Structures are given as structure tokens and as C-alpha cells.
Design a protein around this nucleic acid. Structure first.
Ligand SMILES: Nc1nc2c(ncn2[C@@H]2O[C@H](COP(=O)(O)OP(=O)(O)NP(=O)(O)O)[C@@H](O)[C@H]2O)c(=O)[nH]1
Ligand SMILES: [Mg+2]
Ligand SMILES: [Mg+2]
Ligand SMILES: [Mg+2]
Ligand SMILES: [Mg+2]
Ligand SMILES: [Mg+2]
Ligand SMILES: [Mg+2]
Ligand SMILES: [Mg+2]
Ligand SMILES: [Mg+2]
Ligand SMILES: [Mg+2]
Ligand SMILES: [Mg+2]
Ligand SMILES: [Mg+2]
Ligand SMILES: [Mg+2]
Ligand SMILES: [Mg+2]
Ligand SMILES: [Mg+2]
Ligand SMILES: [Mg+2]
Ligand SMILES: [Mg+2]
Ligand SMILES: [Mg+2]
Ligand SMILES: [Mg+2]
Ligand SMILES: [Mg+2]
Ligand SMILES: [Mg+2]
Ligand SMILES: [Mg+2]
Ligand SMILES: [Mg+2]
Ligand SMILES: [Mg+2]
Ligand SMILES: [Mg+2]
Ligand SMILES: [Mg+2]
Ligand SMILES: [Mg+2]
Ligand SMILES: [Mg+2]
Ligand SMILES: [Zn+2]
Lengths: 129, 14, 313
RNA sequence: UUAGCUAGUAGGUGGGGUAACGGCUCACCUAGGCGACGAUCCCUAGCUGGUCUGAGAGGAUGACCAGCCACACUGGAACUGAGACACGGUCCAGACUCCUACGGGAGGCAGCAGUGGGGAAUAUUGCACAAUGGGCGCAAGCCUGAUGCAGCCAUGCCGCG
RNA sequence: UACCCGCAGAAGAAGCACCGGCUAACUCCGUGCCAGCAGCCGCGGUAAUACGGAGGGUGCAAGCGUUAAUCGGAAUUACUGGGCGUAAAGCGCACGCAGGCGGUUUGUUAAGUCAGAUGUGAAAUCCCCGGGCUCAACCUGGGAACUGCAUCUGAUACUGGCAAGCUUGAGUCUCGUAGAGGGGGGUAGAAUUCCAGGUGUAGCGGUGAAAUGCGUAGAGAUCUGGAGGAAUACCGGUGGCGAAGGCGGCCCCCUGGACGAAGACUGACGCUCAGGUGCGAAAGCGUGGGGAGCAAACAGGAUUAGAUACCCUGGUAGUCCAC
């Protein structure tokens, strides 16, 4: 059903980005905040707010160029049907280093560019292309 | 198509 | 390749990829055919070469190179098949029928029209006559007397009784004969009673229906008379190819109707809806039976229904 | 188009057993054991370090080199000895051939070549302990078809005219 | 022995395959779908660079072609990296075990994973830089590689386990509304056919046209009365219901799910499914009933070349119910 909520999060981002929507809403969680705040610090989105404490509702502000999609495509890599893990030197790049790869480690959620100074590996979340 | 289907039986090489 | 002596021999039968060729002494020797041959029929004298034996005394086939000219030909057209010759090089045909399953008269009439365009003399021969009574036999004899006034010889035989076989053989020697007829009219059994042929195959005989007849034996197999001449068996045929010529030739397809031409009112006549037809006056007089005249325009009205789409050679 | 398999089988006591633990063996006691994460049955196959192919992931295979296991005409058994259930040790049976005075014995080229035969197809019935390794001996020395070499085979790679 | 000095003179030392396109190279003659060629496409019956030969050339080279075999090309068993409306393919449908997977908050364990380190992954082969044999092949120094496995110390975001939860997921109650949902038992009226009676007369019936068939024992038609059988006009509509096949007169009884409103309440109780399990159009099969109409086989008449089919008059099995 909603068994991969991160893949449900990537579905709601990719649709409203392409369909010229100004802002989207989604059910919040701890892990969804730990991904959207990284995308806010990497220039892909604008802002996020939390609403509700018994039903946590996350909101995302979209971002455009001249009415053109900033996030052109995003790819869920690991999934509950097949888990993907890499080491500190087998971290894949997106568009040969242009896009970022969201990898959550013990030192929080960071990119593979940020995992060079950290020297860790773990679960690949999404290819932000 | 499903990876979990190939756990039971792999792709049958002719 | 590596062929033998060019010589003249008689083709026994036709098998598509190959043919059975009898030599000049009585040797069954199967051969294939040349690619440029337009047609090859049963009983056609050809130029052929018997290959070469690979093992000494054991050969497989030869080839049939060339085909001689035709004395006669039996061309009957068909829907979506075209004009196809069945047999050729013959002087006499014998129309063979039986009282079972049916004895029609329209099957008789269009072989008469065909033989008028081939200069061949057909002979009406009935089989299975032992099953009827003398009351029924006298009626069938009466219906063939009309076919006796028109000049065609009628010999009425039976295979399981051996009646009339000796007068059937006296007029039949020195010639080749087609035993034409429908399916299951006693074609194979009359071949057994005349020849005395090799009884170890002796035919394929399956004709068992509710009211019908079956065509089990194939197109034509060649054998020889004890006196002289050849035999040609015929398929069980229910077809009538009249795509050949004009209905002026239909008037020529009947013997006694020759002597009554040029006697009607007009110079052209349909002979059915035209006033004062002298052919119709001859039927009303009784010198021509009305069974033939009603079947005569049935042939002409069959040309109103076969002609419809189109066909040409 | 193999779903149930298994009674020394699974476990325990005690005796016995080998160099060592142990159903390895024996009596008794228990009724369990294995198995849809493939037990069991049938067929096929020596395996691995690797070679070859492929951008890689994968794919096909296991000759030469090296490591290990099994096997030494077929089958079974034990002795000897630190080490074998023993390629050129023995014993018994079967199969085949040889010798014979008819009663008997002899033999194991999957060692080097080499013959017969099979098959599309694979070699001289060569030389030497000079070197290396091993065996015996205090050493000298001897032995080594291991190996070092030579010939044949455009069989492959590479170089030149 | 390699090596080296010296001698004589180009003297002792080049072939095979191809030549339409793929794929490098074009003309000519001979032959006449014959011979042949060929891996594919397909060439040649009167002008063939494709056959045979010649001329000339191309690609290789002491080798050159062919055959057989493995992978690649082939993303053509698709993990990387394929599809399933009609190209081959979504079981007829539903329930559900094992298996896979799982919302949200916190703590804990560090299981999976990740970081570091030790030990190990024999040598040779491959890779990196060298050295050596006149060169190369080949031999060889050290390093890297061998992405493996085992152990210890770490980090806790995610996945797993435990613990306490939370409510939007999934459920429970009440008030309601719609429906051919299923099963069982009655009941109605047309129409069909049979039978009884009445009035009534020469054809009824059927087809393109006719015939078989029925009827002066009075058919057919009409009216009265009765019997049996099966189906439910109109309503009725890309209308409704059911997991699906499917389900239609009305009424009662039993019973199933679906949906909506207002709240209350349990607290992931869920999704999915190989074997297994049940339902599942009609035909047909077994036993015992039932019998109008329709109707395989078959009877009979037209059609026809024959009619076996079509058309028509009849007609059994079956269609009906129980099991
Ligand atoms: N009572 C009887 N039966 C006969 C007579 N002649 C032939 N038959 C039978 O009729 C049947 C048909 O004979 P057949 O010759 O096979 O017929 P056909 O015409 O050759 N058949 P097809 O068309 O297959 O070649 C056979 O069973 C044969 O025994 C006869 O005179 N009397
Ligand atoms: Mg016959
Ligand atoms: Mg013990
Ligand atoms: Mg060796
Ligand atoms: Mg070895
Ligand atoms: Mg041993
Ligand atoms: Mg032994
Ligand atoms: Mg030996
Ligand atoms: Mg040998
Ligand atoms: Mg041989
Ligand atoms: Mg070119
Ligand atoms: Mg050639
Ligand atoms: Mg020419
Ligand atoms: Mg060379
Ligand atoms: Mg091949
Ligand atoms: Mg592939
Ligand atoms: Mg495809
Ligand atoms: Mg299809
Ligand atoms: Mg379906
Ligand atoms: Mg190594
Ligand atoms: Mg080394
Ligand atoms: Mg090396
Ligand atoms: Mg060099
Ligand atoms: Mg009624
Ligand atoms: Mg509560
Ligand atoms: Mg039955
Ligand atoms: Mg009918
Ligand atoms: Mg029944
Ligand atoms: Zn006239």
C-alpha cells in the first residue's frame, strides 16, 4: 500500500513539478524531514513547514526556472523489495557527479560529496537527477 | 520482472 | 542427372513428383519429370531416359524428358482450378454406371456432348443389375432403349454375376478404354472380372454410405487386356465443365438432333420460348422422348448459372 | 513427468574398538531422525587456483603448469611397516592370453616409447646422469624413461630473409 | 652450441583466397533456370562484373582458406538491462497457511549494513614499473590485484528484534437508503399445444416458387370450458446488483455483501499469495421423475451434379426438477 513512504514522497514531488503546481502537501514523518531539509540545502526546493501534531502534514514549496522543472527526474534506488547498500568507495554518482545521491549514514543524511569528508557508507535513498 | 520471483526460480536459459 | 537411353515408352500413372513409366516390354520403372513439362497424363507415350543404376542392378528413378503429340485429350475445366487434362491418346470411352446409389440421366448427357467434341464413341454400361427384380429390370431396359435408338451401344452387366462380359470384351479389344462414372458405381469390380489381374492388391474398395457412394480409388491406373489394348480407371466425378464453346456446340452434342436441324421457323432459335420449334415438334410427336428434351434445356439453363462470375483459360 | 525417505536408521546407558572423538561395533532403552531453505530417487560430471569470451555484471569450460581427492585388468580381504588397505607387494575368485611331458603354473603398458584396434585426428621402439630434485651410504660412488635434452608433427605464438 | 671472423655472387629462398551487396576490388567471353554457384539476400531460359575461363585488382602472408566447437554480437531468459489491451504471454474467479512486505513516535539491542584494525585469501596466470635473452615471443624482480572469509573495537540515520505508544491505514457499533444477490415455498395472467362442446365450410398449412404434411370422421377460423408444461411482454435504459460465470412476473420467509451521515471505540489488528480449498456458461455423463414448445441423430418432401447442409413438414436424446 503506502509501504514505501519515501517512494510515495518522490511521486508527489515529481508530479507537481511537471504539472506546474505551486506547492504540494504530504503526510510528514521523521525521515521525510531528514530528506527535504537536505534538498533545501542543495538548491532543489525552497522551503518546508510542518502542520499538525496528531496528523503530521508536511508541505513543500516548488521551484521553477522559467516555468521549467528544476528537478527534471528523480529515481528511487533502494526499496523494501530489494535493499541496496554500498561502501565508502563504491558510492555512485548521478550524471557523472552533477546530480547528488542521497545516502543516509550514522552521521545523518548527507550526499556522496559530503560522505567523502565523512568516509562512511550505507543506504542509498534516491538519485536526485 | 520481480526480483522476489527469481528467488524461487531463476531465468531458464535455453 | 547421368541419364540413360532416350526411348519411347508408356506412362502408367501420375504421382506429381514422379510418374510410373512402362518400357517397351512390360517393365514397371518409376521416373520423375522435366520442369518444362506443361502436363503429363495417364497413358501418354513420352521420350524418357532411365537414369543410371548407382548400385549394379539397383536403380531408383529415371527422368521423363519430352512429351509426344496428343491423339486425343480429355479437358474438363473446374472452378478455381482451370482447364486440366485428365487422360489422353484414346479411341474409346466406356460410360460405366450402377443402379446403386442412383442412376441419373443428366450424368449421361454431358459426356455425350464432350465426346462429340473429341470424336470418341462412348458406351453405356450398367452394373449391380442382379439386385433388382424383372419388373424393375424391364423398366431400366426400357429407359435405355431410348439410348439404343440414338446409336450408342448398351451392354448391361453385373460383376457378381458375370453376365454379358464376353460381348463386352469383343467390341473392346484393340483400343484403350476409360471407365467413366460417378463415385461407387462399380468401377473397380468390373476391372476384376475382365482382367484376371494380380489379386494381391486387387483394388481399394470402400463405398459404404447411407444413400450415397464413395470415391476411394484414385485418378487412373494402367493395366493391359489379355487380348490387346489398355484400361484407364476414372475418379468418382460429380462435375460438369461446359466453359469450352458456344451453345451452337451444345446443339451438335446430341446425335439424333443433328438430322432435325434446319427445320424450325427462324434461322436462330432458343428452342424453348420460340414459337414453332420443329425440334419441339419432334418431341411432341414421340420420336424423341421428353426426358431428353427437358434435360436439354436444363443444360442451357445450367449455362445461365455456371457462367455468372467468369472463367477463362 | 521423483514427495515422503529411513530400524544400526536418530538419541542414551554400558562393553568393545582405532593413533585420536564418534553407531566405528555389540546387547539394552527411547521413537525419534531427515524433508518443499529440495530429503530421497534417476541421469551427468573429478574439483579448485585458472584459461577463453565480454565495457562491466555475467557467460562457457577445467588440456599443458601447480594444489587436492579418487583409481592402478574386475571384485573382496588382510599382513608388513612410522606412514598403504599397496601402480611395477601378497592372498582368494572371475575374465582373457601364454608355457606345458596334461597334472599344472605365468601375466597385468591408465610408467617411457612402440604395435594392433577405434576414430576426422596427435610423435622416435632416441641420448645422458652434465645440471636440478629424490632414494641408499660416513663419504666416495651407484640408481632415477623424474627431469635435463634431441628428433618427428608450419600444431600454435613471435622474429627475419 | 649460441655468438663471431672470412669467402662467393642476387646468386639458395612467395603463395593462397576474393572480386553483386553485406565487405576491399570491373570489364570481357563462353554457357542458357540446363550445368553449376551459395553463409545470408537470392544469381543464370539469349547483354550473367554473382556460372566457367581470361585480363586486371584487392585482402593477407610462409602461410592462406574451409569445416566443427565456445562466448560475443543477442538488452534473444533482460540483477545490471525486456515484456504480458490486440505482436507469444495476466491462471475463469474468490478465500487463505507457509513465504515476501509493511503507517507513525520514543527507548533499547547492535542482528543486517557501514567505519577502522588484525589474521588469512599457496605459487604460477592477469595488471603496474623494471631487468634479461641481439629483438619479440618468452623468462623474471618487487608492488598492486585476488572485490573473499573469520575476529575485535566503533558509530545508530535506515532495515530487523524487544518494550511502551499514537491514530490517518485496516476494523467495530448505531441511525438509515438503494438493488434482477442467493436459497426455499406459494400464487397470477397472456401465449403455445393437447382434449371436450358449440356455430360454421373447402381448403388449411408452408416457400423465391412448390411439395411432403393436415382436413368433409368437418380441418383451419371463432367461442365456451378444462388439463399440462416452460418462460416472464410493457416497465427497461452504455440502468442496477454480485468475486466471476451470471442474475428479471408478483408475494412471504430465511440470509449475504455494498454505500452514506453523525460520533464513540480497538490500536497496524495490514497488503499479497506457490501447494491446499470452494464457486464456476452451456453441452455431455449416472439414478429416478417430467414433457408443451423448440430441437443433434433420424423420417419425409423440394433444391441439386449429388443434398449428406441450406428451405419446409414432423420428430427422439436433451432442454425441466431432485440427487
Ligand atoms: N451385388 C453386386 N454388388 C456389386 C456389383 N458390382 C459391384 N458391386 C459392389 O459395389 C461396390 C462398389 O464397387 P467399386 O468397384 O469399388 O466401385 P467404384 O466405382 O470403383 N468406387 P470408386 O468410385 O471409389 O472407384 C463394391 O462393394 C462391389 O462389391 C454387382 O454386380 N452386384
Ligand atoms: Mg474404384
Ligand atoms: Mg558409547
Ligand atoms: Mg607432465
Ligand atoms: Mg593434477
Ligand atoms: Mg588407496
Ligand atoms: Mg588393491
Ligand atoms: Mg605396471
Ligand atoms: Mg604413455
Ligand atoms: Mg578403425
Ligand atoms: Mg565496394
Ligand atoms: Mg568461384
Ligand atoms: Mg549471355
Ligand atoms: Mg610468421
Ligand atoms: Mg555453428
Ligand atoms: Mg545476453
Ligand atoms: Mg522484446
Ligand atoms: Mg497474441
Ligand atoms: Mg479476469
Ligand atoms: Mg597467488
Ligand atoms: Mg609473486
Ligand atoms: Mg608475473
Ligand atoms: Mg627490449
Ligand atoms: Mg395458455
Ligand atoms: Mg486508546
Ligand atoms: Mg448418457
Ligand atoms: Mg432441418
Ligand atoms: Mg439427463
Ligand atoms: Zn427451333
Amino acid at each position: 500500500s503506502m509501504q514505501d513512504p519515501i517512494a510515495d514522497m518522490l511521486t508527489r514531488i515529481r508530479n507537481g513539478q511537471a504539472a506546474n503546481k505551486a506547492a504540494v502537501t504530504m503526510p510528514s514523518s521523521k525521515l521525510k524531514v531528514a530528506i527535504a531539509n537536505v534538498l533545501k540545502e542543495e538548491g532543489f526546493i525552497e522551503d518546508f513547514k510542518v502542520e499538525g501534531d496528531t496528523k503530521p502534514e508536511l508541505e513543500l514549496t516548488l521551484k521553477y526556472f522559467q516555468g521549467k522543472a528544476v528537478v527534471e527526474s528523480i529515481q528511487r534506488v533502494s526499496r523494501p523489495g530489494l535493499r541496496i547498500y554500498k561502501r565508502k568507495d563504491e558510492l555512485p554518482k548521478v550524471m557523472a557527479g552533477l546530480g547528488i545521491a542521497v545516502v543516509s549514514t550514522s552521521k545523518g543524511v548527507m550526499t556522496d560529496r559530503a560522505a567523502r569528508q565523512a568516509g562512511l557508507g550505507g543506504e542509498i535513498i534516491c538519485y536526485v537527477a | 520482472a520481480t526480483v522476489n520471483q527469481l528467488v524461487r526460480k531463476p531465468r531458464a536459459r535455453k | 542427372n547421368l541419364f540413360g537411353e532416350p526411348d519411347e515408352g508408356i506412362v502408367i500413372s501420375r504421382f506429381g513428383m514422379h510418374a510410373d513409366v512402362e518400357s517397351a516390354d512390360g517393365d514397371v520403372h518409376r521416373c520423375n519429370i522435366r520442369r518444362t513439362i506443361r502436363s503429363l497424363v495417364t497413358g501418354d507415350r513420352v521420350v524418357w531416359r532411365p537414369g543410371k543404376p548407382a548400385a549394379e542392378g539397383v536403380n531408383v528413378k529415371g527422368i521423363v524428358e519430352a512429351v509426344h503429340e496428343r491423339t486425343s485429350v480429355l479437358t474438363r475445366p473446374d472452378f478455381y482450378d482451370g482447364v486440366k487434362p485428365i487422360a489422353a491418346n484414346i479411341d474409346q470411352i466406356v460410360i460405366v454406371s450402377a443402379i446403386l446409389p442412383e442412376l441419373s440421366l443428366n450424368i449421361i448427357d454431358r459426356y455425350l456432348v464432350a465426346c462429340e467434341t473429341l470424336q470418341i464413341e462412348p458406351i453405356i454400361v450398367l452394373n449391380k443389375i442382379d439386385l433388382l427384380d424383372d419388373e424393375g429390370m424391364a423398366f431400366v431396359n426400357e429407359q435405355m432403349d431410348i439410348y439404343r435408338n440414338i446409336g450408342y451401344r448398351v451392354l448391361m452387366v453385373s460383376s457378381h454375376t458375370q453376365d454379358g462380359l464376353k460381348p463386352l470384351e469383343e467390341a473392346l479389344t484393340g483400343r484403350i478404354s476409360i471407365f467413366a462414372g460417378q463415385s461407387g458405381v462399380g468401377k473397380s469390380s468390373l476391372l476384376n472380372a475382365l482382367l484376371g489381374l494380380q489379386k494381391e492388391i486387387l483394388t481399394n474398395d470402400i463405398s459404404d454410405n447411407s444413400g450415397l457412394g464413395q470415391h476411394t480409388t484414385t485418378a487412373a491406373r494402367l493395366y493391359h487386356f489379355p487380348h490387346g489394348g489398355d484400361v484407364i480407371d476414372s475418379p468418382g466425378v460429380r462435375e460438369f465443365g461446359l466453359w469450352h464453346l458456344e451453345p451452337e456446340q451444345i446443339t451438335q452434342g446430341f446425335v439424333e438432333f443433328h438430322d432435325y436441324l434446319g427445320l424450325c421457323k427462324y434461322r436462330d432459335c432458343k428452342h424453348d420460348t420460340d414459337p414453332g420449334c420443329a425440334i419441339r415438334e419432334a418431341v411432341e410427336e414421340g420420336k424423341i422422348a421428353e426426358t431428353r428434351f427437358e434435360n436439354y434445356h436444363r443444360i442451357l439453363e445450367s449455362m445461365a448459372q455456371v457462367k455468372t462470375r467468369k472463367n477463362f483459360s
